[PDB]
Point group: none
Chain length 70, copies 2
Amino acid sequence: MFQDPQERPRKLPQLCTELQTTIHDIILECVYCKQQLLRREVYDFAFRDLCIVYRDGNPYAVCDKCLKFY
Amino acid sequence: MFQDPQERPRKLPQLCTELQTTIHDIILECVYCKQQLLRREVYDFAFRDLCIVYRDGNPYAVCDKCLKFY
Ligand SMILES: [Zn+2]
Ligand SMILES: [Zn+2]
């Protein structure tokens, strides 16, 4: 879960800050196929221009698969 | 390998500029595995606050494989 005092950042780096962790530890899931995004590929989110997609009420990411879909 | 009059810095981004290439095209080898790092691994190296380890005279790096051990 992610509630107060956390505000649920819309940015990957900030999301890790509120979660009290690093981008190397936080593992996000795909919003489309719901697959686990490998930490190595998670860095591509910050490397390229991608925003965090919130599915229902949780922070999700776009995998290398769905990346070309949107 | 790297020789004069190249400056050969310890930072990957600067090395790319000196080599007149990009981080996507630059080829780095592992100091441990002795193999060539993958494009995804090179991105990780540039994402982390790591420096290039010069061994024997060739700019070697540390892939995610050895990186998790340290
Ligand atoms: Zn996906
Ligand atoms: Zn290695």
